Amino acid sequence: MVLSEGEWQLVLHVWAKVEADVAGHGQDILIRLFKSHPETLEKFDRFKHLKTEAEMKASEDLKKHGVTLLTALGAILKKKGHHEAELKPLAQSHATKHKIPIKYLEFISEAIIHVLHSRHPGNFGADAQGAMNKALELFRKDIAAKYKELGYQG
Numbered sequence: 001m002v003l004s005e006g007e008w009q010l011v012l013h014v015w016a017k018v019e020a021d022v023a024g025h026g027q028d029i030l031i032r033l034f035k036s037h038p039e040t041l042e043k044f045d046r047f048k049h050l051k052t053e054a055e056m057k058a059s060e061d062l063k064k065h066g067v068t069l070l071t072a073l074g075a076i077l078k079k080k081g082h083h084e085a086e087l088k089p090l091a092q093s094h095a096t097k098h099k100i101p102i103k104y105l106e107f108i109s110e111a112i113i114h115v116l117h118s119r120h121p122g123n124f125g126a127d128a129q130g131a132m133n134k135a136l137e138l139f140r141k142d143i144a145a146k147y148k149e150l151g152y153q154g
């Protein structure tokens with residue numbers, strides 16, 4: 001698939017707001033993911049033991065990882081579809097080391113869209129949400145193709 005420049009502008013316009021607070025957004029997103037789909041928490045051996053949202057909010061480690069996660073995603077969105085190089089090491093570690101099924105990348109895509117919608121209503125109307133969804137679907141499709149080449153397709 002291919003996004004138009006107008007769709008990329010709607011995606012990078014709301015992403016510029018997310019970047020004003022990367023650690024806060026990283027925390028909200030991971031907590032929304034773990035609450036909504038608790039089975040995903042099991043994949044993080046580092047966080048597995050967190051029982052409540054209050055423990056999640058207070059974990060400095062969790063917040064550090066949320067910044068690592070969003071910084072990598074941001075670098076991929078800013079490529080505007082030319083992300084082949086960025087996608088390689090990410091597809092290799094998530095398929096071979098972490099073992100993250102495509103379904104879980106769909107679940108965190110849902111969490112990203114929920115959080116931007118709650119925090120940035122003015123910059124995340126229907127058209128901006130359709131463009132962000134297209135951008136994350138492109139990301140998932142390309143990662144899924146690489147997972148296949150790597151021998152995982154999960």
Ligand code: HEM
Pocket residue numbers: 040041043044045046065068069070072073089090093094098100104105108
């Ligand atoms: C927007 C999607 C995602 C991005 C851009 C992302 C990015 C990253 C990055 C940059 C790292 C550190 C380097 C590496 O190991 O590759 C990482 C580590 C990891 N990711 Fe992801 N990730 C994504 C989705 C997920 C999802 C959905 C899960 C699990 C349900 C997951 C599980 C993990 C685990 C277990 C690690 C290692 C954490 C720790 O022990 O250090 N990732 N991810």
